[PDB]
Enzyme design. Structure first.
Site, PDB file in Angstrom:
ATOM      1  N   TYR A  37       0.819  -1.203   0.000  1.00 33.42           N
ATOM      2  CA  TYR A  37       0.000   0.000   0.000  1.00 33.42           C
ATOM      3  C   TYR A  37       0.858   1.261   0.000  1.00 33.42           C
ATOM      4  O   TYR A  37       0.395   2.328  -0.395  1.00 33.42           O
ATOM      5  CB  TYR A  37      -0.956  -0.006   1.194  1.00 33.42           C
TER       6      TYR A  37
ATOM      7  N   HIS B   7     -15.062   1.441   1.121  1.00 38.94           N
ATOM      8  CA  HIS B   7     -13.916   0.558   1.310  1.00 38.94           C
ATOM      9  C   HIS B   7     -12.701   1.315   1.839  1.00 38.94           C
ATOM     10  O   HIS B   7     -11.584   0.801   1.822  1.00 38.94           O
ATOM     11  CB  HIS B   7     -13.565  -0.151   0.001  1.00 38.94           C
TER      12      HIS B   7
END
Ligand SMILES: [Zn+2]
EC number: 2.3.1.286
Lengths: 235, 7
Positions: free
Chosen positions: A53, A108
Site C-alpha cells: 500500500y 472501502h
C-alpha cells in the site's frame, strides 16, 4: 429534483492509470487477494502488506495520474443536483475528490488515510508507512494500518448507503465488477424501493442482467455522454 | 449488509 445515487467501482479509474484485480488472473499488481487484502495476510506479513500500500499510495500521487472525463462528469452532476446527489465509491483513490466531488462515501476506505490499530481513529497520510510510526491518540501508542476495508471486514457508511438506496429515484453503477459484496447487491436493494437502475461499464458486470438501462465502452466517453443526456433531460 | 466478500 430527482434523487440520484451513484456507485463507482475500479473501472472508472482504470483509464486514469489505476489498476486493481482483473478477471483473467484474479491478481492485483501480480498479488493474490488473500495476501494483500485480508486481515490474515496483514498478520502474516505486515512488512509486505504495508509496503504494498506504500507503493499504491505513492503511485496514486504521481503527476501522470489524473482524473479522467468520467470523474469530471460526475462532478458536474453533483453541481446540478446539489444535495439530491450521493456518490458512493468502492475505490480507495481520491480521483473523485480531485475531480470536484464532495461528501464522497468511501465504503472501502481511502488510500490516503491510515487507522490506529486499537483506537480506530483515522489520520490523513500521504507518505510511506514505516515500522517507526505509531498513533498520537492513545496514551500508550499503537501500530498503524492502511484505512482500507479488506475482505472479511465491514464496509464503511453502510447505514447511510442503505438509507440513500431506499430514497434514490435513479441508481447508477459505474465501473463495477459485480463480484464484490455487499456492493454488488446494491442494485437489487435499489430496485425493491422502485429506483431506476443504470449500469455504465467497460466490461458488463455479472449482475448486469439486473439493471434496467445499460451502456458499455470506455468510461471517459460513456459516462459523460450519459451524464450530459441526464442533464439535458432535466433542462 | 454483511462484510466485504467476493464470489
Ligand atoms: Zn491510537
Amino acid at each position: 429534483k430527482p434523487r440520484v445515487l451513484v456507485l463507482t467501482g475500479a473501472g472508472i479509474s482504470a483509464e486514469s492509470g489505476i489498476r486493481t484485480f482483473r478477471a483473467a488472473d484474479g491478481l492485483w499488481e501480480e498479488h493474490r487477494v488473500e495476501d494483500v487484502a485480508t486481515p490474515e495476510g496483514f498478520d502474516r506479513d505486515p512488512e509486505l502488506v504495508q509496503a504494498f500500500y506504500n507503493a499504491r499510495r505513492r503511485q496514486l500521487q504521481q503527476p501522470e495520474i489524473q482524473p479522467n472525463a468520467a470523474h469530471l462528469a460526475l462532478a458536474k452532476l453533483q453541481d446540478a443536483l446539489g444535495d439530491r446527489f450521493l456518490l458512493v465509491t468502492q475505490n480507495i483513490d481520491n480521483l473523485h475528490e480531485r475531480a470536484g466531488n464532495t461528501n464522497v462515501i468511501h465504503m472501502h476506505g481511502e488510500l490516503l488515510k491510515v487507522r490506529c490499530s486499537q483506537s480506530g481513529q483515522v489520520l490523513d497520510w500521504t507518505g510511506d508507512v514505516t515500522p517507526e510510526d505509531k498513533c498520537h491518540c492513545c496514551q500508550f501508542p499503537a501500530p498503524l494500518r492502511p484505512h482500507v476495508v479488506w475482505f472479511g471486514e465491514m464496509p464503511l457508511g453502510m447505514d447511510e448507503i442503505y438509507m440513500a438506496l431506499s430514497m434514490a429515484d435513479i441508481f447508477i453503477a459505474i465501473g463495477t465488477s459485480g463480484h464484490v459484496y455487499p456492493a454488488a447487491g446494491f442494485v437489487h436493494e435499489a430496485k425493491l424501493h422502485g429506483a431506476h437502475t443504470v449500469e455504465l461499464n467497460l466490461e458488463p458486470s455479472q449482475v448486469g442482467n439486473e439493471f434496467a438501462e445499460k451502456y458499455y465502452g470506455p468510461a471517459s466517453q460513456v459516462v459523460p455522454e450519459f451524464v450530459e443526456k441526464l442533464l439535458k433531460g432535466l433542462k | 449488509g454483511g462484510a466485504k466478500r467476493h464470489r
